[PDB]
């Protein structure tokens, strides 16, 4: 019974701001140290700040210090981290961690992990994706193998689902990861090779499922 | 602050063997280094501190060693759950700092990418942009790098690439890469272009399409 419970995922207009949440009601919560590293898409860690509860003694990264507010509450032994000002740049996962509750030194690594909240800054609202085919054709046809595909664009937030045939094609199939777009709306590609020879016999749909948006889609793609 | 550099950044092996990570700290820390590992899409996990100290539960074939400046990670005979990325941290003192990470891969022979090059579709011209989209399939290792040719004319800028993880049955990279204009500059050129450039391809190989056929 001695976790980190972190808030749910959550989705901010830039300029807002964000309060994160990590429950540790296991042990004495004065023995943690609740600390917060961040994760941004692609990169590294990094140290946000922490807190030791009661006691009340909190350090913070220079490179947030302004923006960000890291507090922890007895009553219910919760800890939080608040950054405000939102920007693009802040989309990233966000993490608490401590070094495991002692029980009456405290080293600052982390035992303990929370499962992370990941935090996106979009201008954008929720919206359903459109869906446009990656036909095959002679420049996508290398020797008997030809790829195909369906770009599943602007839609907001993640994430959508990428079926091939109902499920029934998954053999070849490559789903890439959704990439956040200048415009803050996702959009992802979702490919299959298949045998050329097939191209006039044989049907290619990729269903494509955006609950966020209750949005279901069936393209067919067919050869230019 | 006290700045801590892993290498190598990307580290290829084989279930079975011996690998060794290092990580150095700008000025001294004692024994005060910690190692966790992370998976994609999940949360980092302890498995060293104090520079030698294995957290319980973690295998025996994971061992660390150092003090001062100079630390490393060990795996004496590494097995599929291994791969993965792995972080040093010091915790001497804050702003508590880590390493950029060491991505432990699965080592494969090299294996160029099949390309292939997709038009926009005239459904998406409807609405104003286009979207021409390059695929490299297949290739490993995972460097590589596309660039988008617009009658001759190199592109900057108006590009987003993505990549796949390893393939856990082929262990090759897929990647995607994505040229937006809008529909106003796409109808205004005529050849379109994505050139690779890969260790497994002697010379860049280039697909391309003259718009409209
Ligand atoms: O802990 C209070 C102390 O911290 C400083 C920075 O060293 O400000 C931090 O704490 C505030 C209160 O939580 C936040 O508003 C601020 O963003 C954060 O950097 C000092 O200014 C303050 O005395
Ligand atoms: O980090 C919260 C913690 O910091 C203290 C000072 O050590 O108070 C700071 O943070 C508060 C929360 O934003 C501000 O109200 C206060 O002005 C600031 O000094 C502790 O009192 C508090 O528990
Ligand atoms: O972990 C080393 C580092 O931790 C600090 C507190 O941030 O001291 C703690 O760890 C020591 C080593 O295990 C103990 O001697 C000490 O009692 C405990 O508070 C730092 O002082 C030290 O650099
Ligand atoms: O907070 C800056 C500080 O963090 C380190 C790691 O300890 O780098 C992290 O933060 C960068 C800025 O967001 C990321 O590029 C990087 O991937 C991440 O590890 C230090 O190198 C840096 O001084």
């Known amino acids: 019974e001695v976790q980190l419970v972190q808030s749910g995922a959550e989705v901010k207009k830039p300029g807002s701001s964000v309060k994160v949440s990590c429950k540790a009601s296991?042990?004495?919560?004065?023995?943690?140290?609740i600390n917060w590293v961040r994760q941004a898409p692609g990169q590294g860690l990094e140290w946000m700040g922490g807190?030791?509860?009661?006691?009340?003694?909190?350090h913070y990264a220079q490179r947030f210090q302004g923006r960000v507010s890291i507090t922890a509450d007895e009553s219910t032994s919760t800890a939080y981290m608040e950054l405000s000002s939102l920007r693009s740049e802040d989309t990233a996962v966000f993490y608490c961690?401590?070094?495991?509750?002692?029980?009456?030194?405290?080293?600052?690594?982390?035992?303990?992990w929370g499962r992370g909240t990941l935090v996106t800054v979009s201008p954008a609202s929720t919206k359903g994706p459109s869906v446009f085919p990656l036909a095959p054709s002679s420049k996508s046809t290398s020797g008997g193998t030809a790829a195909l595909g369906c770009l599943v664009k602007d839609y907001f937030p993640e994430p959508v689902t990428v079926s091939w045939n109902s499920g029934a094609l998954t053999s070849g199939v490559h789903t890439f990861p959704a990439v956040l777009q200048s415009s803050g709306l996702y959009s992802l590609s979702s490919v299959v090779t298949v045998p050329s020879s097939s191209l006039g016999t044989q049907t290619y749909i990729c269903n494509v499922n955006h609950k966020p948006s209750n949005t279901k889609v069936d393209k067919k793609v067919e050869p230019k | 602050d006290i700045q801590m550099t892993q290498s190598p950044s990307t580290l290829s092996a084989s279930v079975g063997d011996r690998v060794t990570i290092t990580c150095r700290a700008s000025q001294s820390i004692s024994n005060w280094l910690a190692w966790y590992q992370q998976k994609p899409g999940r949360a980092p996990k302890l498995l060293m501190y104090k520079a030698s100290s294995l957290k319980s539960g973690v295998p025996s074939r994971f061992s660390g060693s150092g003090s001062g400046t100079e630390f490393t990670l060990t795996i004496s005979s590494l097995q599929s759950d291994d791969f993965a990325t792995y972080y040093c941290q010091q915790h001497d003192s804050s702003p508590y700092t880590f390493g950029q990470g060491t991505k432990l891969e699965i080592k494969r022979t090299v294996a160029a990418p099949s390309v292939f090059i997709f038009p926009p579709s005239d459904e998406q011209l409807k609405s104003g942009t286009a979207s021409v989209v390059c695929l490299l399939n297949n290739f490993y290792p995972r460097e590589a790098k596309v660039q988008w040719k617009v009658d001759n004319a190199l592109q900057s800028g108006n590009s987003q690439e993505s990549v796949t993880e390893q393939d856990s049955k082929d262990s090759t990279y897929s990647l995607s890469s994505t040229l937006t204009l809008s529909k106003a500059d796409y109808e205004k050129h005529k050849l379109y272009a994505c050139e690779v450039t890969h260790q497994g391809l002697s010379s860049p190989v280039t697909k391309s399409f003259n718009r409209g056929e």
């Open positions: 961690a401590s070094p495991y509750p002692n029980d009456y030194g405290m080293s600052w690594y982390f035992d303990l």
């Open positions: 296991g042990g004495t919560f004065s023995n943690y140290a």
């Open positions: 807190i030791i509860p009661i006691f009340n003694i909190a």
